[model samples]
Target: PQITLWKRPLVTIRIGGQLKEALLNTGADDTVLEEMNLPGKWKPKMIGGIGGFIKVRQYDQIPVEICGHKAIGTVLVGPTPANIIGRNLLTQIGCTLNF
Candidate 1:
C-alpha cells in the first residue's frame, strides 16, 4: 500500500459578505460553494448541479493558489458545506485524477 499527499492552495471567498478559506480539492467534479463567514449582501443561491446554468445574486472573483498554482474565477455562491474545491478550477490547471 502507498499513500500520496498533494497540497493544493485554499482560498477564502466573500459570501454573504464574509470571507473563509476552503481546502482545494482536485477530485471533485463540481464546485461546492458554502455560505460561511459571509458578509451581509452576499447570499447563497441554490443550483441544480455542476453542469447547468444557474443564476446568482452576487459573485466575486478571488485569487486561489493550489499546489503553487494560482487562478481567479467566480465560484458558486450559497449555503453549502464548509467549502469544496471542485473540478471547475482543477480542469483549468490540467489536473489529472489518480484512480
Candidate 2:
C-alpha cells in the first residue's frame, strides 16, 4: 500500500509472539524495538544517534510479520521510544519510496 509522508507510516507487526504498531521508516538502518522479553540468545550491540550512543541487545534470525508479510531478520531491543522497522527488514518486504 502506498503511504504519505504527511502522516506517520505506521503498520502492525508481529514479533516474539507479540503484536505491536511500528513505523516503517525508510531512513532507519536497523529494526529497533522497545524493551521486550524476547526468548533467545542475543549479543550485545552498540547503537548511537545524533544524541548519543547506547547498548542494545541484538537478536538474530528472528521471525517478524510486517503488515502481514512474514520475514526473518535481526531485531534490536533497546531504549527506542517506539518500534521502528528499518531498511534491513523493509527491503525484504519489497518496500519502495515513491512520490
Candidate 3:
C-alpha cells in the first residue's frame, strides 16, 4: 500500500495557552509533547502507551493554523524533541495513510 502524503505549513502550538514550535511528523501514531518544557502550572500526569505509557497533563486548546487549516486540542505533554503532528491530528483534517 502507498502512504498518502500531504504537506502543511508548520505552525506553532500554544500549549497551555503558551505559544511554541511544533514539528509535523506524519509517521507518528499519536501526538506527544515535552513534559519538562511545559509551564509549571501545566500539571503532567502519566498515561499508558502500547507497552508502558507516558505521563501527560491538561493543555488549553489554542488556535493552530497550518497551511490554511486549523485545529484545537489539548496537547499531550511528555518527552519529545518537539510537539508532533501525528495520526490523531491528521484524522481531524480527513487524511489517511496506507502502508
Candidate 4:
C-alpha cells in the first residue's frame, strides 16, 4: 500500500504496545519518540536536528507497528516535539517517496 506524504506526513503507529501519532520523517536518520517506557538497557546518545541537539535514550531492537505493517529496529526516546518515524523504520514498512 502507498502512503501519501503530507506536509507533516503524520501516521498512527504502535510502540511499546501502545498506539501513538508519529510523523514520517524521511529527513531523519533514526526514529525518535516523544516519550516511552522501554525495557532493557539503553545507552545515552546525542541527536541533532534543524533546531539543535539533545540527549536521548537509544534503545535497540524495538518493535513498531506502522499502519498495520510491523517493523523492528532502533527507537530513540527523548524530548521531541512529536514522534518521528525515520527511514530506518519507514524502509522496513515499504514506504518510499512517490514524487
Top candidate by lDDT: 2
Over 1-99, each residue of candidate 1 has an lDDT whose tens digit, in order, gives 122455545655433334557755665555656643434354455555456645444355655554446655556655554476677776765666567
- In candidate 1 the C-alpha lDDT for residue 91 amounts to 73
Root-mean-square deviation of Cα positions for candidate 4 versus the true structure, in angstroms: 1.2
Model 1: which ten-residue window has the lowest total lDDT? 35-44
Question: Using alpha carbons, what is the TM-score of model 2?
Answer: 0.95
Per-prediction tally of clashes: 12, 0, 6, 0
Per-residue lDDT of model 3, residues 4-37, tens digit only: 3465435565444556666566666666766545
Residue 14's lDDT in candidate 4 = 91
lDDT of each: 0.55, 0.92, 0.58, 0.91
Best by TM-score: 2
Candidate 2 per-residue lDDT over residues 1-99, each given as its tens digit? 777888899999999899999999888899999999999899999987768877889999999999999889999999988899999999999999886
Q: Which stretches of candidate 1 lie over 4 Å from their true place?
A: 1-29, 36-44, 48-60
- List where candidate 2 sits over 4 angstroms from the true fold: none
For residues 23-82, write the lDDT of model 4, one tens digit per residue: 889899999999778898999999999889999999999999998899999999999998
Give the TM-score comparing model 1 with the true structure, all chains together: 0.49
* Predicted candidate 2, C-alpha RMSD: 0.9
lDDT of model number 1: 0.55
Order of the predicted models by TM-score, top scorer first:
2, 4, 3, 1
